[PDB]
Design a protein around this ligand. Sequence first.
Ligand code: NAP
Ligand code: SUZ
Length: 316
Amino acid sequence: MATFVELSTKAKMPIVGLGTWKSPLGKVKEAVKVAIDAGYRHIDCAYVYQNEHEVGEAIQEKIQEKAVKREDLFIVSKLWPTFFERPLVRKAFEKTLKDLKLSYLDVYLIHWPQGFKSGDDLFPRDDKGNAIGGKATFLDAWEAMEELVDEGLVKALGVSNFSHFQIEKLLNKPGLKYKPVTNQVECHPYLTQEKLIQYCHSKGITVTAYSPLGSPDRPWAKPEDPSLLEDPKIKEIAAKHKKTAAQVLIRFHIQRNVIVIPKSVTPARIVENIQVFDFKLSDEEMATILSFNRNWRACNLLQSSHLEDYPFNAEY
Ligand SMILES: NC(=O)c1ccc[n+]([C@@H]2O[C@H](COP(=O)([O-])OP(=O)(O)OC[C@H]3O[C@@H](n4cnc5c(N)ncnc54)[C@H](OP(=O)(O)O)[C@@H]3O)[C@@H](O)[C@H]2O)c1
Ligand SMILES: CC1=C(CC(=O)O)c2cc(F)ccc2/C1=C\c1ccc([S@@](C)=O)cc1
């Protein structure tokens, strides 16, 4: 059975969710439909993925067809940092919610802590491709997002790609109404996030692991980049359980009580990826996997590294 991680709000967040970044139009609706049929309840979405309108169609279909009730779904989206100015937070949210055809979101995340130039150019950049910053901050954004929770449009807020310093800046903000329920960050055996997970858990903040398979189809991959799915040592552990590497990579997070959101539009893989509750990695296997840490990021966003709130300069 597909288990949950309890949030600070007492809401139950399904521990495996479906990722939707780069899920193409014409495939993402079917991906969400297959996922819901396979027992997924948690779907991870974003404004910047530009496919929320199709995700919304799929969700609406399955609810209509009595496959699932809204209350049993757990829908997450994210505020892109070109929308940190107060009026833009509301407008960006309204587009996300309208696209998803929902009356509320379960969690709404700040997608990245660093502010970008405000507006509807999602990737404002210079000639070299470096991100253009904006003066509105994640605290400005949070302020506007808190209204959504007051109004019942969002059940809980969270953050993504925040370091512990940025989470501290948020938690210690005088006059804070709502606390983040999760920090969605890259996490897998090459980036085990031990210090950040410990920190977040100590503050009652869950962690959601993105790119758990190493994001093998990311547009900026470099052939010398490591490959988790083909890693002989990961494969060895998979073989031990007669499971696939992907299932080991997903189960890894489950055993750390970390939510994990593998992306697929392939029905067989969508099913495979949630077949992770009928085996257990041994204490020794978990220790071996943790030892693979390389501090390697598939998502380092180097093009924003000059910005004030770029999160990856800190140790954690
Ligand atoms: N907050 C953030 O900044 C942030 C950053 C990155 C990602 N995310 C979220 O996290 C989700 C997951 O991360 P991700 O999409 O970067 O990468 P990922 O889930 O690590 O890997 C996805 C890739 O692996 C393939 N795949 C999926 N299941 C497989 C399996 N069982 N065997 C072999 N290959 C498999 C997929 O192929 P097919 O789709 O062709 O099947 C796709 O190419 C995203 O979709 C997004 O929702 C958030
Ligand atoms: C890491 C990353 C993700 C993954 C995710 O959030 O799920 C992503 C998703 C999108 F729909 C668009 C951009 C990004 C992205 C980094 C990024 C890439 C190029 C630019 S501009 C420089 O071309 C800016 C940022």
